[PDB]
């Protein structure tokens, strides 16, 4: 049943930075993916209660979603771009772990992942 607390979006004792890459990750990469027709399952933490998936957080112990990432970027939570890319990678990987190849949700993630890889290919060099 119940949902866990969502991942933190602020941590006062974590060092933070703004870099041009992190700017780009928010203004271009996240904001492009966000507007995609297949984005909505990934825009917030999985609501396992509403979905009647009581084993979701039994299996997925490092949950991640674009809603969390968006807020992290907005709050300058990250030290560098790679920390943020890792959160995207976790989100995709979680999807592929929990679901079956060819499930609709996997097709949705895959469309987003392909687009994600296209967009980070154009990440500007650091500073
Ligand atoms: C990111 C993600 C990864 N995996 C899955 N798997 C999944 C979802 C639904 C099902 N159904 C199976 C039988 N059926 C009757 C109910 C549900 C099976 C597997 N889902 C995801 N995201 C995702 C998929 C569908 C719906 C929502 N909505 S949500 O969590 O309430 C909100 C609006 C907060 C994002 C969110």
The whole-angstrom separation of Cα 8 and Cα 64 is: 10
The whole-angstrom separation of Cα 40 and Cα 112 is: 11
Cβ 25 vs Cβ 34: under 8 Å: no
The whole-angstrom separation of Cα 111 and Cα 109 is: 5
Residue 105 alpha carbon to ligand 1 centre in Å? 8
What technique determined this structure? X-ray
Run of H or E residues at 68: helix 66-74
What are the residue boundaries of the structural domains of the chain, listed by start? Answer: 19-123
Cβ 91 vs Cβ 110: under 8 Å: no
Question: How large is the angle between the packed helices 81-98 and 66-74, nearest 10 degrees?
Answer: 170
The reply to whether ligand 1 has any atom less than 6 angstroms from the CB of 66 is no
The whole-angstrom separation of Cα 126 and Cα 21 is: 6
The whole-angstrom separation of Cα 39 and Cα 6 is: 18
Residue 44 alpha carbon to ligand 1 centre in Å? 11
Structure tokens at 93: 């990987």
Structure tokens at 92: 């995709």
Cβ 115 vs Cβ 7: under 8 Å: no
CATH of domain 19-123: 1.20.920.10
Residue 46 alpha carbon to ligand 1 centre in Å? 6
Which residues are CB-neighbours of 34 under 8 A, at least 6 positions away?
A: 43, 66, 70
Structure tokens at 104: 């609709």
3-class secondary structure per residue, the chain: CCCCCCCCCCCCCCCCCCCHHHHHHHHHHHHHHHHCCCCHHHCCCCCCCCCCCCCHHHHCCCCCCHHHHHHHHHCCCCCCHHHHHHHHHHHHHHHHHHCCCCCHHHHHHHHHHHHHHHHHCCCCCCC
Cβ 16 vs Cβ 78: under 8 Å: yes
């Amino acid at each position: 049943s119940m949902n866990p607390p969502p991942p933190e979006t602020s941590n006062p004792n974590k060092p933070k930075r703004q870099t041009n890459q992190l700017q780009y990750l928010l203004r271009v990469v996240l904001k492009t993916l966000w507007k995609h027709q297949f984005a909505w399952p990934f825009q917030q933490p999985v609501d396992a209660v509403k979905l009647n998936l009581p084993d979701y957080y039994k299996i997925i112990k490092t949950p991640m979603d674009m809603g969390t990432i968006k807020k992290r970027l907005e709050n300058n939570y990250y030290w560098n771009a790679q920390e943020c890319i890792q959160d995207f990678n976790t989100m995709f990987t979680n999807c592929y772990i929990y679901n079956k190849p060819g499930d609709d949700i996997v097709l949705m993630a895959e469309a987003l992942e392909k687009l994600f890889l296209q967009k980070i290919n154009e990440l500007p060099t650091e500073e």
